[PDB]
Amino acid sequence: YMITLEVPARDRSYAWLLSWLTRHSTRTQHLSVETSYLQHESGRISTKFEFIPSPGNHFIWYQGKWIRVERNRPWESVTFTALGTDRKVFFNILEEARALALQQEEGKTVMYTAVGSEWRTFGYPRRRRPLDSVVLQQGLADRIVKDIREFIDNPKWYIDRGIPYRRGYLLYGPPGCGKSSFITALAGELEHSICLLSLTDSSLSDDRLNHLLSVAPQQSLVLLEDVDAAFLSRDLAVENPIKYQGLGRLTFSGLLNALDGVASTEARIVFMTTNYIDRLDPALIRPGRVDLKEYVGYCSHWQLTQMFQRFYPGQAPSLAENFAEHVLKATSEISPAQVQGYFMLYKNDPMGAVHNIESL
Amino acid sequence: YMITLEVPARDRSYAWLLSWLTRHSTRTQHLSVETSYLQHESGRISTKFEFIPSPGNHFIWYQGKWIRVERNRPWESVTFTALGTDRKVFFNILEEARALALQQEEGKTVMYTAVGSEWRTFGYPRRRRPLDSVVLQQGLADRIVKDIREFIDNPKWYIDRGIPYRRGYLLYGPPGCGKSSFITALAGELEHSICLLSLTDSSLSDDRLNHLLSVAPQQSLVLLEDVDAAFLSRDLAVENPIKYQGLGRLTFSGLLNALDGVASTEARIVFMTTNYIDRLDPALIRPGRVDLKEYVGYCSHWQLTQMFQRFYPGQAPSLAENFAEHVLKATSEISPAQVQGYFMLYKNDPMGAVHNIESL
Numbered sequence: 001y002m003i004t005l006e007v008p009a010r011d012r013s014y015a016w017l018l019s020w021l022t023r024h025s026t027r028t029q030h031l032s033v034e035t036s037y038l039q040h041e042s043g044r045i046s047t048k049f050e051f052i053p054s055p056g057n058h059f060i061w062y063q064g065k066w067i068r069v070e071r072n073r074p075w076e077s078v079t080f081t082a083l084g085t086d087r088k089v090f091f092n093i094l095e096e097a098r099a100l101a102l103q104q105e106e107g108k109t110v111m112y113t114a115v116g117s118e119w120r121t122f123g124y125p126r127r128r129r130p131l132d133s134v135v136l137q138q139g140l141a142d143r144i145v146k147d148i149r150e151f152i153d154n155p156k157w158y159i160d161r162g163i164p165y166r167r168g169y170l171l172y173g174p175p176g177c178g179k180s181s182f183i184t185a186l187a188g189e190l191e192h193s194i195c196l197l198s199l200t201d202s203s204l205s206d207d208r209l210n211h212l213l214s215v216a217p218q219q220s221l222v223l224l225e226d227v228d229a230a231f232l233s234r235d236l237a238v239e240n241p242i243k244y245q246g247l248g249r250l251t252f253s254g255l256l257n258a259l260d261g262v263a264s265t266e267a268r269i270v271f272m273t274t275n276y277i278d279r280l281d282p283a284l285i286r287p288g289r290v291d292l293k294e295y296v297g298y299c300s301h302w303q304l305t306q307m308f309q310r311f312y313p314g315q316a317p318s319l320a321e322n323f324a325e326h327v328l329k330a331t332s333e334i335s336p337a338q339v340q341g342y343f344m345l346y347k348n349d350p351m352g353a354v355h356n357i358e359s360l
Numbered sequence: 361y362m363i364t365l366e367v368p369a370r371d372r373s374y375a376w377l378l379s380w381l382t383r384h385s386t387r388t389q390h391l392s393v394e395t396s397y398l399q400h401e402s403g404r405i406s407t408k409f410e411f412i413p414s415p416g417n418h419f420i421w422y423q424g425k426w427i428r429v430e431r432n433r434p435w436e437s438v439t440f441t442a443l444g445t446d447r448k449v450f451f452n453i454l455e456e457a458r459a460l461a462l463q464q465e466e467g468k469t470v471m472y473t474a475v476g477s478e479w480r481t482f483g484y485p486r487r488r489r490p491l492d493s494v495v496l497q498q499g500l501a502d503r504i505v506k507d508i509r510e511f512i513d514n515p516k517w518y519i520d521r522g523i524p525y526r527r528g529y530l531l532y533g534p535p536g537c538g539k540s541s542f543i544t545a546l547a548g549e550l551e552h553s554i555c556l557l558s559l560t561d562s563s564l565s566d567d568r569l570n571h572l573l574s575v576a577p578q579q580s581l582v583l584l585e586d587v588d589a590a591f592l593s594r595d596l597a598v599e600n601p602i603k604y605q606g607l608g609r610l611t612f613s614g615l616l617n618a619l620d621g622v623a624s625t626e627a628r629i630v631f632m633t634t635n636y637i638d639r640l641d642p643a644l645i646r647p648g649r650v651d652l653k654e655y656v657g658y659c660s661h662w663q664l665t666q667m668f669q670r671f672y673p674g675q676a677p678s679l680a681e682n683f684a685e686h687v688l689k690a691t692s693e694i695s696p697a698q699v700q701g702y703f704m705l706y707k708n709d710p711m712g713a714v715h716n717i718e719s720l
């Protein structure tokens with residue numbers, strides 16, 4: 001007579017338990033190697049040999065209980081066998097795992113991915129990009145931030161009238177203007193998590209897409225990159241239905257219903273990005289599916305001035321005006337990425353980038 | 361000499377027994393983790409650790425009978441082994457499961473889905489949308505409600521003359537007018553259940569479609585979304601037979617016979633939705649397969665007035681007339697979804713949406 005807690009692979013606290021188990025690797029006869037390397041120079045690579053507990057029956061001595069944990073071997077099922085019937089030690093283990101895991105993810109952003117029909121983490125947590133480091137047009141980031149915050153802070157008003165509690169944003173513009181960078185900065189600012197979804201995958205279907213959109217982690221953003229490339233439309237729409245034009249078992253109607261239909265879930269934010277606004281079917285970007293659409297474009301006077309004052313702090317304000325005037329006189333349109341590269345050429349050299357502005 | 365009740369996966373009361381078993385999880389040596397999370401803020405996520413009984417041979421103490429329940433492990437078969445030959449405990453268990461399950465589904469709508477050749481539930485029951493929250497044209501929802509109620513309440517008249525006891529409705533219009541929302545509201549009002557069916561699935565055939573249409577749950581609605589996209593027609597029909605145009609092993613004649621043929625079942629309601637009424641073959645929408653067809657269109661004066669008086673309750677009636685007049689003068693055609701979004705911009709701000717009506 002014992003208690004055999006069974007936690008299979010498909011669990012939210014799976015990573016938390018794995019992290020705690022790696023933390024409590026002491027007193028474990030079976031091990032797995034945990035070496036990592038940091039090269040410095042001269043062929044002297046630092047070693048960091050450690051011990052991940054192997055998928056075995058290691059006996060743990062938590063609170064003097066001789067707890068036995070077994071991880072099997074692609075299907076995985078972790079087991080926490082104990083003595084008697086207490087259930088308190090399980091709660092303590094879960095709480096300690098939560099305390100340890102959330103401590104690790106502090107000041108970072110966790111990136112998930114779509115594996116099969118489920119979300120799994122993708123690498124170590126990434127360092128968040130400061131929001132002010134991304135410079136957009138005057139009064140554009142503030143509007144999006146305010147709209148998202150208002151949507152988050154008013155759930156009652158949605159329920160009191162019956163509208164589904166959902167939202168969606170679309171960003172479009174020329175290549176190299178700040179779409180992905182702004183999305184990353186916003187995710188870092190809002191302390192959310194990014195879920196990456198590809199519509200051209202070879203293992204995605206309508207039912208799997210609906211399940212993925214239904215089981216998305218809480219306090220997270222869903223990102224759809226280049227929705228146009230997954231469905232040719234417009235000129236085709238005048239003659240025949242919208243073909244899928246790719247590899248994967250997906251249909252236009254399935255995606256349309258999944259984004260906003262009858263079985264769509266609640267409390268979800270979806271971001272979409274494209275480079276050809278005119279290649280998107282009108283039914284896809286109608287209100288209800290895309291509440292706010294914004295255009296990010298080429299540089300302007302204020303944007304160039306802010307970029308200059310950001311890359312060379314401490315300089316006099318006249319230099320920024322000189323740089324902006326010269327850039328806008330020498331060329332008409334320019335992308336922020338090109339300006340960033342040109343600045344990267346002249347590292348820590350103010351008044352040097354104000355002279356060699358020949359980039360026609 | 362015992363009694364071994366066997367209930368495989370393909371049963372209607374399967375969910376009821378699973379819910380009862382989760383209710384009676386006490387005195388079970390083997391367990392499975394039942395933790396859920398509700399984020400609040402500051403990285404403080406509430407834990408709800410519980411215990412779903414694992415697929416094991418847990419010994420239950422219902423009525424002091426030492427009942428043994430075993431769930432195997434994709435094929436599933438639940439077993440209720442008991443002592444002697446009584447069969448009374450089985451009646452009591454089924455009745456308690458029914459009492460518990462129907463208690464949970466109160467005021468909600470259950471959404472089913474097509475898995476293989478059987479209907480299975482899809483997530484938690486969803487909150488029902490009030491019917492008055494969806495505003496359609498004058499005297500349109502009432503007609504459909506009355507027709508459906510008349511069909512439900514008169515089975516004798518159908519039998520006494522020999523007509524098959526079936527019905528079907530079709531809704532068509534511009535994208536973003538209220539088709540799906542009205543269907544959801546009607547399903548909530550009628551205390552029915554929604555079954556989602558996709559005609560472009562990669563595992564659908566004529567025999568499977570017939571089986572699914574024959575085994576649909578009682579007191580339920582069958583929904584076919586975007587029937588046009590599954591069969592190109594019209595201009596093709598003038599030259600060659602109807603092609604399927606997609607992925608899946610289905611034919612036009614198979615669908616036509618399944619909807620209304622010789623083997624079609626009785627007491628079934630089917631809803632169909634499309635955006636291009638002119639792309640549907642005449643044989644598909646003939647009487648007998650689609651009894652009532654209705655058109656949902658753009659906004660009108662009364663619809664706009666009702667929407668305004670719904671989103672801002674307590675306002676004077678003149679404001680609604682002013683808003684309707686200004687909207688209809690500034691623009692001719694406008695979808696209700698755009699009106700909903702424009703109202704969503706001005707939250708709790710009457711007399712503000714009556715001034716900034718520039719949405720051309």
Ligand SMILES: Nc1ncnc2c1ncn2[C@@H]1O[C@H](COP(=O)(O)OP(=O)(O)OP(=O)(O)O)[C@@H](O)[C@H]1O
Nearest residue numbers: 133134135136175176177178179180181336337340
């Ligand atoms: N507004 C901006 N301010 C600062 N850096 C920017 C800005 N826009 C782009 N960059 C820089 O350009 C590089 C890539 O930008 P990013 O990937 O966000 O562009 P994009 O417009 O989303 O491109 P693509 O459409 O090809 O995905 C990064 O080094 C990023 O810092």
Ligand SMILES: Nc1ncnc2c1ncn2[C@@H]1O[C@H](COP(=O)(O)OP(=O)(O)OP(=O)(O)O)[C@@H](O)[C@H]1O
Nearest residue numbers: 163288494495496535536537538539540541696697
């Ligand atoms: N008549 C209406 N009254 C109130 N809200 C409406 C109405 N029509 C649409 N909406 C709102 O529009 C949004 C989506 O509407 P819905 O999905 O029902 O439109 P649809 O015409 O069925 O669209 P699609 O053809 O793309 O499926 C929801 O927020 C819903 O509340």
Ligand SMILES: [Mg+2]
Nearest residue numbers: 178179180181
């Ligand atoms: Mg990018």
Ligand SMILES: [Mg+2]
Nearest residue numbers: 261539540541
């Ligand atoms: Mg709809």
